Design a protein around this ligand. Sequence first.
Ligand SMILES: Nc1ncnc2c1ncn2[C@@H]1O[C@H](CSCC[C@H](N)C(=O)O)[C@@H](O)[C@H]1O
Length: 274
Amino acid sequence: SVLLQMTQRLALSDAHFRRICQLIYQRAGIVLADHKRDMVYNRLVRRLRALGLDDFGRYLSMLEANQNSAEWQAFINALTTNLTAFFREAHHFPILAEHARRRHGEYRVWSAAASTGEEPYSIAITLADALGMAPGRWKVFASDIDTEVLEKARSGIYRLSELKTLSPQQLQRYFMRGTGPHEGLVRVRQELANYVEFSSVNLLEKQYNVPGPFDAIFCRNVMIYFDKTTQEDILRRFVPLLKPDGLLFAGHSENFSNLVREFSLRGQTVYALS
Ligand SMILES: Nc1ncnc2c1ncn2[C@@H]1O[C@H](CSCC[C@H](N)C(=O)O)[C@@H](O)[C@H]1O
């Protein structure tokens, strides 16, 4: 009753790995480590198979040849790191609500690395609680370079355990719980989902197609995958996108001020135009 399986087993050479690293760096600015190679292999072989290739050299050539193919997106999605959580670095939220309470008119926020949507929905919940759900008062724009995580973000479905940081009131007001097969699952209510717009934006663009200026820009835990030149380039692009007294929120381990002096620290990893 034994019938050994065996599906296609290809080989990622040192040379090919180095090539993958250069390509993603030039494209998305992401700097990969040598300890991610087994991971890179497991996620990329699936592309080789789907396309019917059995050579990493041939795959990389189709990519290098055609700089605009849809395959470039599958390549990117395979190598990004999307770890996130609802209300991560929670100290930022009371600060945002504080800022919003002042700046009247339309309060606009840009979440520059949305991942699967946890950060933008955290922002929306904070604003809905602070300002109330009323059309015209505030809006959240969210983007990411990865289209797989953006599609999940757009669906707004999460497992109830991922929401341990919400109060029973936020849960009731902003989500619908599931029953039967898809239970233990909740979905963001359409009412709250209408206040956030999702779009794919690669931070390495020399020009962003975003509805700025913004009162606040969240750029948390992404700069960590880029190098300093790349980081400085992006930060300088955020400058014209910030309204006069706007806020730039960075990730726990990021220090922006040391990259561009036009930014100044104001709170727990929060910057303001100097
Ligand atoms: N060049 C680039 N342009 C835009 N987004 C990028 C990028 N390189 C990586 N990213 C994205 O940055 C995201 C970081 S995950 C961080 C999510 C959230 N800000 C957190 O603090 O919880 C990844 O999902 C990845 O797709």
